Amino acid sequence: MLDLPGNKDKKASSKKSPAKVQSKDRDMGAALRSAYQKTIEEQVPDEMLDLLNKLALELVPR
Amino acid sequence: MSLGQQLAPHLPFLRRYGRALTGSQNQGDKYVRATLEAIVAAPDQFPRDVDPRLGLYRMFQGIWASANADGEAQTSQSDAEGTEAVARARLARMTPLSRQALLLTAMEGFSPEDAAYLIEVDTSEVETLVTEALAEIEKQTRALELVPRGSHHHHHH
Numbered sequence: 001m002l003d004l005p006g007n008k009d010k011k012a013s014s015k016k017s018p019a020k021v022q023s024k025d026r027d028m029g030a031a032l033r034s035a036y037q038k039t040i041e042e043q044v045p046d047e048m049l050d051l052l053n054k055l056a057l058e059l060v061p062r
Numbered sequence: 063m064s065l066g067q068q069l070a071p072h073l074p075f076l077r078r079y080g081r082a083l084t085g086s087q088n089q090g091d092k093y094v095r096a097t098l099e100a101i102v103a104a105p106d107q108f109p110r111d112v113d114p115r116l117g118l119y120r121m122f123q124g125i126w127a128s129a130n131a132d133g134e135a136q137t138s139q140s141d142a143e144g145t146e147a148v149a150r151a152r153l154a155r156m157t158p159l160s161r162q163a164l165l166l167t168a169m170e171g172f173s174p175e176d177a178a179y180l181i182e183v184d185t186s187e188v189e190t191l192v193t194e195a196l197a198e199i200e201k202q203t204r205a206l207e208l209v210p211r212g213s214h215h216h217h218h219h
Binding site (some may be wrong): 024 | 069074079093094146167171194203
């Protein structure tokens with residue numbers, strides 16, 4: 001008395017598909033995004049990375 | 063090379079919405095700088111391998127959540143008339159977190175799974191938070207009027 005396989009199954013496809021993000025929150029998402037895109041159309045500080053100039057970018061001559 | 067090449071290109075993103083999560087430039091400037099100083103002694107707590115932006119937001123909200131938990135902060139506000147007061151003057155009744163889920167799923171396209179990790183809830187809870195957010199949007203977009211009435215009677219007065 002014994003048995004053996006003869007079939008199989010899966011739950012994935014190792015693949016991906018496109019999407020949409022303008023038919024689930026309408027233009028309201030672009031309204032908020034545009035108001036704060038303006039916040040990125042400008043310069044940035046650097047004093048925060050100067051806090052790294054004492055632990056990840058130090059140097060000494062000679 | 064170094065953290066700066068993964069901090070600088072996302073450095074202003076903490077003010078890209080911090081300007082409306084506390085309503086003050088003095089608070090927004092000290093939160094981003096206090097977020098960095100809180101990592102000068104624990105850079106292992108600031109990974110970016112999950113996403114180049116998911117780690118930036120986790121540490122910034124950590125300082126903010128510690129501020130209102132000690133009275134060092136209060137509810138948000140605005141100082142403009144068409145770029146942050148617009149997000150207040152029309153949504154002054156949305157809960158303090160569905161507004162974060164809104165900027166997390168209508169401005170960033172991120173999945174609900176990592177968006178749930180960004181507010182420490184389950185995936186299905188983010189789905190509810192955005193469903194209630196868009197419901198309060200489509201209902202009014204500016205709350206121009208209200209009418210709680212709908213019925214009457216004429217045999218008791």
